[PDB]
Amino acid sequence: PISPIETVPVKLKPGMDGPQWPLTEEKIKALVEICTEMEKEGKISKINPYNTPVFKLVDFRELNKRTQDFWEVQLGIPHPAGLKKKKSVTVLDVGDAYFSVPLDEDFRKYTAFTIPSINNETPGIRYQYNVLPQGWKGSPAIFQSSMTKILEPFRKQNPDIVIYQYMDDLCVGSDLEIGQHRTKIEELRQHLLRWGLTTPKHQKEPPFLWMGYELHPDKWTVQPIVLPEKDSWTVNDIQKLVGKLNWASQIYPGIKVRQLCKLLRGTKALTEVIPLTEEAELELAENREILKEPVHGVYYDPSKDLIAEIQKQGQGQWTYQIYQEPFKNLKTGKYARMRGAHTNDVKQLTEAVQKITTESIVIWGKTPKFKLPIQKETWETWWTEYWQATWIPEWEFVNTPPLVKLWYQLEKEPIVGAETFYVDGANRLGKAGYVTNRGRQKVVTLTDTTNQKTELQAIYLALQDSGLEVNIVTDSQYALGIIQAQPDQSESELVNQIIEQLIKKEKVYLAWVPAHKGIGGNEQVD
Amino acid sequence: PIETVPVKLKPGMDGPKVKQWPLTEEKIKALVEICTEMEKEGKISKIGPENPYNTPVFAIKKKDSTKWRKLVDFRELNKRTQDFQLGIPHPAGLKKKKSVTVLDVGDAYFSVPLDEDFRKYTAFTIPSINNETPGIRYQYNVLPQGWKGSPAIFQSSMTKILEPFRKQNPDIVIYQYMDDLCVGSDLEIGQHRTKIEELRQHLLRWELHPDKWTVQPIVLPEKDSWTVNDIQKLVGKLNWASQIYPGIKVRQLCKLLRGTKALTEVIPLTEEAELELAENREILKEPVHGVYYDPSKDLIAEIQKQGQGQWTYQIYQEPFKNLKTGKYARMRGAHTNDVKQLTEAVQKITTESIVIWGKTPKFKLPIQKETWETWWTEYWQATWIPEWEFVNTPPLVKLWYQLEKEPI
């Protein structure tokens, strides 16, 4: 009910001022009864120019607009795999406890609201809160902090008792034995009750509902969320389906949604009913089999270190799994990728590592040792030469293909004997071709292009019409860099083209020179 | 608790509310340990949720720091703190000195209170692994290290503290940037280090070589026989250099390049081109004329990765008008760690940016933000933290400055 806790000072937003619908005789009666009660319990107090509309519900929407800002409540959630397996784990639902914490007397005023009278223009009944009001801005923020202090002592008192705060939740684990543990929860409840923090009549139990997760004792299982099978698929429905489908692809490696997505193409409304294709019916079905299957995981045991192994589900598609004991995974996930303007697999491999590394540091405060699909020479050959600062923490090469590697490598020096193609292309349509040293020549008129494309096609053709070894000199700094970055995938089909071709050769030397200049060869195409 | 001056924020501006990046457990440990002491020593004190501000906090291990040192990122705050007058002037000399030594004196600040009305802004937070508990948030009651307002307020006392040595030895210069103290003298190795010690004594009781930093020149290739490619590359760099030295001529060369020849093909040099190089070589022997520091403009420091552990940099304020250029070679052991080398470089550059101009340059880093943010602190060893932005090195800027003192 009420508490003897050091209230906290609440101010209105920088230089602002504090913030009733007509009701039914029935809604009035009901609301007056509720309030006289809510009054007595020592929560509200009859009384002030302010007012918030009561619907029982109170619309602080405006109050809150006019209330200060607090320290970010932190919308970052603890993840099961970050829990340390414990002999015992009670969970207390504190929730209603905020109505137990006092409100900064001064502020209270604003909270004022009104209860309508039948005969309007007759004083309705006015009140205001004395403790954190459900619906108010600082309530959550404040109640937490309160709690945190109220534990503090106790957390020091008994160190082996591990507590977790989270909204209206208080997960308490320990390695104490049953009745031994039991009694501790008992003392905590009291400590809390010794302040006004009352706890349940309907005590929560072992298999736990971590939004999506099923938290069991010393392990966790995934509470299989089903696929609403039907034969009338609305747009909304196929989306929501892809939504849960994708959530799944993470802990269930195997889910695919290509064909289900296709169903979205051209759609003209949410309610539209899209008939599933054959491949849709199959995929969507082979996915009903995976989801049936339940997946279990372990917990963090500081005693044994962390390990992460990754793999490529497809170009720029990564699957990882973090574990302490082989086949005993702590967590797993997938990174379907962007398909950047101009990337490469090794680089991409890198960004996968980087997130993991961060993800870990949160969950464990430590980073994992890495098992990865790449030759150390490959890594080496690449990173020591790329123009960008890059790195992978401690790792080892795992040989479980497909391996990620260097689809190609431009030469460091011109190829002797190999042919030489001086290429160039170029208005707001165009042309682009080449003239080798050994006679050969081409050109092509392009309908609907831009300077870029042309240049590129130039280089493209150059590669088409050449042997397994070619020397190509060009003047597109843009083309140059792109390529010189030896990328194995891009946004540009054309670029894609070139990559194809580039891969195709046994040796390719790219050279670049400044345009418009009299640079021979360069001035011919020019 | 002597007295506090009523510092404020730049008009209109508001307190920092920066995300506390994710931290390793151990770091957290150290922090927490560190922070409790200071708490009980009255330096800092826990705050509520009513304090919406925040600044990042990390923990680092300096040279001899075999134990963790606490580091805070007041850069955002610093940017919002009303300017200051009592701020130390630049002794354009330490640069010219024979040798320098840096000194961490932030400690000094704890003994001076901070206005009760400003404290809310120094709010920083110690996060808990996997969000078991909210973070542990404090505030500062004293002058925090890493904040600009500090060395400013503790200026009067810094002079008092130093004159007995300053006044004593006027042949040695002492410069104070932020938490640091740059000490320079021409005395030989032992004769310097000893004096330092005396100075350390004075303070308790209460190395660099700016001479050898030669802004390197560019040197063109010089083989005995030239290929088509060889010219082409050369010509490319020259055509670029023209943006610094317009006298650079590349005509007598672009001639040697007409006809569609194998790149591998050898070409003999015309006596004009022979001179053209000669003439270009000479133009390259010196820094472009008309380059003067403008203290009103920001100092920009760009860095390129030349590979094999090598790194090049140029501090400049206006493009192509470099105040200084340099190469940097990775530290011993740092082999497999690009991030370390870069973090090392950056420091060694902000080092000179201070010695020389007494202020930190804004960096342009050839690295992905995500990557950098994940690991720099792991090898940072300074009390200060410059400003940065990440970039995409143009292949030519790299090729050119690769030509510097790519030694003999």
From Swiss-Prot, chain B:
Query: Changing A59V: reported impact?
Result: Confers multi-NRTI resistance
Q: Per UniProt, what does mutating K212T do?
A: Confers resistance to atevirdine and zidovudine
What does the record say mutating D64A does? Answer: Confers resistance to zidovudine
Q: What is the effect of changing G184S?
A: Confers resistance to efavirenz and nevirapine
Task: Please list the residues that bind Mg(2+) 1.
Answer: D104, D179, D180
Q: What is the effect of changing M38L?
A: Confers resistance to zidovudine
Q: Where is this motif: Tryptophan repeat motif?
A: 372-388
Q: Which residues form a coiled coil?
A: none
Task: Summarize the impact of K97N.
Answer: Confers resistance to atevirdine, efavirenz, emivirine and nevirapine
What region holds the Reverse transcriptase domain? 41-208
Site residues, Essential for RT p66/p51 heterodimerization: W375, W388
User: Changing D64N: reported impact?
Assistant: Confers resistance to zidovudine
Effect on the protein of changing K67R: Confers resistance to zidovudine
Q: What is the effect of changing Q139M?
A: Confers both multi-NRTI and multi-NNRTI resistance
The effect of N51D is: Confers resistance to stavudine
Protein name, UniProt field: p51 RT
